[PDB]
């Protein structure tokens, strides 16, 4: 009955949306961008090393001051390091030792952490008493938490393994918007420079684009071929990169509705776990599963550097807000500041 | 003066490091386990809301930390990677609608061949052995039409018969074990090991089988450090 009719309009809509992308695919940044100046081999060396964690590090996030750094490990710790002098400013003992994400507030007052407990706990650093304690216990999700990001001191965007993203209100503790439309587990998210839009790559090989004002899904991209494990916004706010489990990274775009470049090498066979951009959006440091941080190039698509100072897989990667340091975490509890 | 706040941080880095050292001892003194039992197989009572139901229990001054993963979705490929540091993976199988055994045979193969879980041993708990002795003794013999190599199968010479069991069930119980012990030997490399066990979900000593099996994993892990084994 209508089941077959529903597929006739869906296939035509998928073809109508595919032909429109082909019309805007004049060059795909492959024939005109070849006449640029490649920066060549950019060699980086580890300047600091944080070996205070006991279990595998799963996430990290820099603050607005670019000095402090919070790291989450699988031992029930939320140590807040001082990247300048290597000082453990705080050591928050978490309830559930299964932590899969962490974030730093844009003001440096609060810190969040999720994990397999489905709870996004908020901790207040600047307390009048001087100690640290959980400020809010956000509950409601039905799947493991993958990534959390702060809009402001009272708003926080999360993403769980229940194919749905959320937007909570720390003041009351209840969510206001529940983004829905993904088929696979959402693995990461990244806020735009302007806190109005954010992307979220899921396990269904589809990277969408939401608007924090409503529950509307602006766009959807399906360039990759496996579970998208990482995502990050371009410093300009009109593009974003996507790492997936099929050993390739693709730079998408919002105004083009399709992928521009596809960074891939014949030797790499391991999936990407973490990606991020530089201050000028010229470098794309992808964290592969081969214990190496292959520094790609957003323009030339050529691997211009490799960071191999890690024993285990690189589970997280964060560049500073000013571009001075690139802190990469790994499963051997060694967070080296590059 | 501008260096007086440094000792205030070095003392903050002293008590925290003193706490990061007393916590390092209690962390490595507890062995984290993973209960990945199949649904409707008595996984909760195999040793006897929230994303993970912790379970603290000690066996001879050894506090284990089991994590029953509940209230999660169907797809497990992404969240099974967080359990690579655990000592073992308690795998409970329902030995008895659709095909229940093949659903647990294809899952064990995925865990065994997962790149992150190739160094994590798996403890196998073949549950519902009391119900197994009733399906093969009389009624629908669903083990014969769901497996074509069971008719031309004989019980091995290493079988230890138990009192009160039918010989047709012993040939069936050990057949399911050989189906699990075929993937763990062919696709294996020698890093992780599989320990099969027989349970009826009512055993009052299930904490001893996990205790002895965990002692064999740490010994085999220590033997790998000195390049002995």
């Amino acid at each position: 009955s209508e089941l077959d009719q529903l597929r006739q309009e869906a296939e035509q809509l998928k073809n109508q949306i595919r032909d429109a992308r082909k019309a805007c695919a004049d060059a795909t940044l492959s024939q005109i961008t070849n006449n640029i100046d490649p920066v060549g081999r950019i060699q980086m060396r580890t300047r600091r090393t944080l070996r205070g964690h006991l279990a595998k590090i799963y996430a990290m996030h820099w603050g607005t001051d670019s000095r402090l750094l919070v790291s989450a490990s699988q031992d029930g710790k939320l140590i807040i390091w001082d990247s300048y002098t290597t000082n453990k400013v705080h050591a928050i003992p978490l309830r559930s030792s299964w932590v899969m994400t962490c974030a730093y507030a844009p003001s440096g007052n609060y810190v969040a952490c999720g994990g397999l407990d489905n709870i996004c706990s908020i901790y207040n650093l600047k307390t009048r008493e001087g100690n640290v304690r959980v400020s809010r216990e956000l509950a409601g999700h039905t799947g493991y938490l993958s990534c959390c990001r702060f809009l402001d001191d009272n708003q926080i965007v999360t993403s769980s393994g229940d194919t749905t993203c959320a937007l909570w209100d720390i003041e009351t503790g209840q969510q206001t918007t529940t983004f829905t439309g993904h088929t696979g587990d959402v693995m990461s998210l990244s806020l735009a420079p302007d806190t109005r839009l954010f992307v979220s790559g899921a396990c269904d090989a589809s990277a969408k684009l939401w608007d924090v004002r409503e529950g509307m899904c602006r766009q959807t991209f399906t360039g990759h071929e496996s579970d998208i494990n990482a995502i990050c916004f371009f410093p300009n706010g009109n593009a974003f990169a996507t790492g997936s489990d099929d050993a390739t990274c693709r730079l998408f775009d919002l105004r083009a509705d399709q992928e521009l470049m596809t960074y891939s090498h014949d030797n790499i066979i391991c999936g990407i776990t973490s990606v991020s951009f530089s201050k000028s959006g010229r470098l794309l440091l992808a964290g592969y599963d081969d214990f190496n941080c292959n520094v790609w190039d957003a323009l030339k698509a050529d691997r211009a550097g490799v960071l191999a100072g890690h024993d285990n897989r690189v589970s997280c990667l964060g560049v500073t807000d000013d571009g001075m340091a690139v802190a990469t975490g790994s499963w051997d509890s060694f967070l080296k500041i590059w | 003066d501008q260096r007086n706040e440094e000792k205030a941080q070095r003392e903050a880095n002293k008590k925290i490091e003193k706490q990061l050292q007393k916590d390092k001892q209690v962390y490595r003194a507890t062995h984290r386990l993973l209960l990945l039992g199949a649904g409707e197989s008595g996984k909760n009572t195999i040793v006897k809301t929230s994303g993970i139901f912790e379970t603290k229990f000690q066996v001879d001054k050894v506090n284990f930390h089991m994590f029953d993963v509940g209230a999660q979705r169907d797809e497990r490929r992404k969240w099974i990677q967080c359990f690579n540091d655990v000592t073992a993976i308690i795998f409970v199988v329902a030995s008895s609608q659709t095909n229940r055994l093949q659903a647990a045979l294809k899952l064990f193969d995925s865990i065994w061949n997962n790149k992150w879980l190739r160094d994590t041993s798996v403890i196998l708990f073949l549950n519902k052995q009391d119900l197994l002795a009733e399906k093969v003794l009389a009624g629908k013999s669903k083990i014969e039409d769901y497996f074509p190599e069971f008719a031309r199968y004989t019980t091995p010479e290493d079988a230890t018969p138990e009192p009160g069991e039918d010989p047709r069930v012993t040939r069936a119980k050990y057949f399911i074990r050989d189906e699990f012990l075929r993937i763990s030997t062919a696709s294996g490399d020698g890093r992780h090991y599989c320990y099969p066990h027989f349970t009826c979900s009512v055993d009052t000593e299930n904490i001893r089988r996990v205790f002895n099996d965990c002692r064999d994993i740490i010994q085999r892990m220590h033997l790998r450090q000195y390049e002995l084994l």
């Epitope: 396990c203 496996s226 999936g271 | 797809e75 294809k106 193969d109 790149k115």
Partner: nanobody, 127 residues
């Protein structure tokens, strides 16, 4: 865009034959494993048979071992399931599931209640 479309179907008598041609467009067909999952009426998704990356291992379930035959054509990206001597209990939809990640010997969540790299299925009913 991982798109898996199948063909075949219709009514066949017990003991007949059918060829389920599963198309695959949008990904490298060689780098990924292939699977066959069927959904009985009012029952859960069960695994039938899988094939290795390039014709290496051909595993079956209990009921289809010897009766069915799965083969892939890497030059045409078409997965086949040569069915022969069917039984009146084989009346079920036939999805063409793909393994989640490439160049691995592990396959996870192919029989899940909801998965992304699966097909629409064909109503292979037996008269």
């Amino acid at each position: 865009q991982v798109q898996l479309q199948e063909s075949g179907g219709g009514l066949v008598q017990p003991g007949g034959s059918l060829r389920l041609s599963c198309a695959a467009s949008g990904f490298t067909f060689s780098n990924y494993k292939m699977n066959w999952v069927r959904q009985a009426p009012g029952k859960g998704l069960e695994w039938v048979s899988d094939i290795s990356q390039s014709g290496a291992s051909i595993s079956y379930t209990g009921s289809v071992k010897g009766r069915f035959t799965i083969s892939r054509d890497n030059a045409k990206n078409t997965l086949y399931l040569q069915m022969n001597s069917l039984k009146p209990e084989d009346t079920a939809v036939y999805y063409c599931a793909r393994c989640p990640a490439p160049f691995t010997r592990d396959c996870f969540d192919v029989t899940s209640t909801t998965y992304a790299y699966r097909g629409q299925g064909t109503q292979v009913t037996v008269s």
